[PDB]
From a paper:
Mutations in [name], the microtubule-associated protein tau gene, give rise to cases of frontotemporal dementia and parkinsonism linked to chromosome 17 (FTDP-17) with abundant filamentous tau inclusions in brain cells. Missense mutations of residue P301, which are the most common [name] mutations associated with FTDP-17, give rise to the assembly of mutant four-repeat tau into filamentous inclusions, in the absence of extracellular deposits. The other three isoforms lack exon 10 expression and have three repeats (3R). These repeats and adjoining sequences constitute the microtubule-binding domains of tau. Part of this sequence also forms the core of assembled tau in neurodegenerative diseases, indicating that the physiological function of microtubule binding and the pathological assembly into amyloid filaments are mutually exclusive.
By cryo-EM, type I filaments comprised approximately 64% and type II filaments around 36% of tau filaments. In type II [name] tau filaments, the core spans residues N269-P364 and adopts a three-lobed fold resembling that of [name] tau filaments. This fold also consists of a stem and two hairpin-like arms, but it is shorter than the [name] fold at the C-terminus. In the stem, the N-terminal segment (residues 271–281) is shifted by two residues relative to the C-terminal segment (residues 343–364), forming an interface resembling that between these segments in the P301S tau filament fold of PS19 transgenic mice. These differences correlate with a local conformational difference around the mutation site at residue 301, the cryo-EM density of which is consistent with that of threonine. The side chain of T301 fits inside the turn formed by the glycine triplet (residues 302–304) and hydrogen bonds with S305. Compared to L301, T301 is located on the other side of the side chain of S305.
Numbering used by the authors:
A (entry chain B), B (entry chain A), C (entry chain C): 269 to 364
Write the structure that this text describes.
Amino acid sequence: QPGGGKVQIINKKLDLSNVQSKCGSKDNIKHVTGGGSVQIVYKPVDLSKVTSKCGSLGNIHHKPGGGQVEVKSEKLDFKDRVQSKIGSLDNITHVP
Amino acid sequence: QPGGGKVQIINKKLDLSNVQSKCGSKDNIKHVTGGGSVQIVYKPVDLSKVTSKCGSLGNIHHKPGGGQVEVKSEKLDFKDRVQSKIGSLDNITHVP
Amino acid sequence: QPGGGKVQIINKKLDLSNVQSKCGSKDNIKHVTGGGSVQIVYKPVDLSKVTSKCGSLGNIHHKPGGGQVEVKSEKLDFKDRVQSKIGSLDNITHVP
């Protein structure tokens, strides 16, 4: 079985592949962005505990402040070029 | 069985593939954006506990502040070009 | 069985494929956006517990603030070009 001439031109920007075989796993692929991404996570956890045993205690003013997560983005320019220029492509096979 | 000439031109921007075989898994593919994405997660968890045993306690002013997650985006320009230019493509097979 | 000349021109922007075989899984594909996406999740969880044993306690003012998740988007321009230009394509097969 003689082979034939194979020509492959591959031009990808993002090629994310997962090949598994009997692999127990969690979440696979997530948060894929071709351009520009902005991700903000805001999970303040509060465990401020006030305990009072036998006795008295005054007033409680539990007033924490909040975060100020601010993002500016002005005059952004992300220009990508994954190209391939070929003047001439020949693929000739001779199997007499 | 002689082979034939194969020519492949592949131009993808996002190629996300998962191949599994007997793999127990969770969520597979999520949050795929070709352009630009903005993702904001806001989960403040509060466990502020006030406990009072045998005795007195004054007033309670439980007034926490809230977060200010702000995002600006002005004059954004994401220009991608995954191209392939070929002047001439020939694929000739001779199997006499 | 001699083969024939095959020519393939593939131009995709988003190619999301899942191939499984006896794989127990959860949610597969979700939140796929060709252009630009804005995703906001707002789950503040509150467990503020006030406990009072044998005794007295004053007034309770449980007034937390709310978040201000704000997003601006002005003059956005996402221009993609996944193209393929071929001047001439020939596929000739000779099996005498």
